[PDB]
Amino acid sequence: IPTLIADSTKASLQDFNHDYGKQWTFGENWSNVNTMFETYVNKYLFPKINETLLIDIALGNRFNWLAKEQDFIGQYSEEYVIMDTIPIEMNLSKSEELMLKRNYPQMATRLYGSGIVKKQKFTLNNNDVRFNFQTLGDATNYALGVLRKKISDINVQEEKEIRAMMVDYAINQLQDSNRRTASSKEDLTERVFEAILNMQNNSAKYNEVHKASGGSVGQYTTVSKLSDIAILTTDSLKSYLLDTKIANTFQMAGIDFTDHIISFDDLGGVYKTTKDVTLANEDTINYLRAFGDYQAMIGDVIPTGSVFTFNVSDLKEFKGNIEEIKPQGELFAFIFDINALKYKRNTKGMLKEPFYNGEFDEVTHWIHYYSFKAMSPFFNKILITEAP
């Protein structure tokens, strides 16, 4: 009946929400005669549910392979390479004192830094979640489901960050020589296909050892084998590249261009703070909480360069202080050797011990892990982007 349903005095919430609630219940009569749920044979029985689905969609980090477990102790990572030496003629006429000549080896280097540690938590209540499920078994599935969703969240976030790292690196921290310009979408496909082959050539031009401390003067010739090359492009661009006949001839040969090319619809959606904003409003903290941020409180300072990973631009403190990490212009192909993405991670004692509140009968569980993400200057990278 519409009125009975409307009354909230008769609610489980009222008893749990407040002290001194009503102990004894005399059942309320129920009828479906003019309501939805009316059944031809038995008008008065309460509606009964066949199933609670619990649909769960597994999501994954495409870049999860190419992740190196680290057993962390210590912070920095060195990453050296040894510079090239060109073979020379015998020149037997030269003085015998040439035997004594040092010829020391030479090298380049890059000290990366340390990695951030991230956390998530879910609180499970013994007392009232039980009201929701018909059977104990469905409730146990619900608990597994929250843990699995948390694991799925780590994966989507890491994938987003690795993708953003590449977009940011390409747009800002790249050797100018590596960059290329494409007038039209058609030209880009020609340029991208020309580039795949260029990496396989043994040449020092594509690599960024000119940076990387080490030697501006010498040469390091790096080669990127097929199977170690992949192209970060937008989804529309991937469609154009696959459409071309060259892609078909490659697949016929045996190299799957489709797996190699990696695409996201916009290569955007990860946001970077600019201008050192500080949380100041209740409304903002509530939005952040909807997205899972228990830790945030008013007066907390968010440093410049903080990566939000969700759109916080609308919120007031961040209104003029958020810039999206996205390819500028529709055309954007960043072709990189796969080995470049340093993506070391530590996942031990991943699921931390539970804490039982004991008042409210609730247990809070936490998942903690260490992630380090960086890109190396040594391997070949080329960026093809629309001409200014």
Partner: peptide, 23 residues
């Protein structure tokens, strides 16, 4: 599309912090 591995046991440091089996 692989996933983060859910669990392995804590490093030697982790266990010794939790227990302090002094020796």
């Amino acid at each position: 599309n692989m996933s983060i591995g859910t669990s392995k046991s804590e490093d030697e440091y982790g266990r010794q912090v939790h227990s302090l089996t002094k020796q």
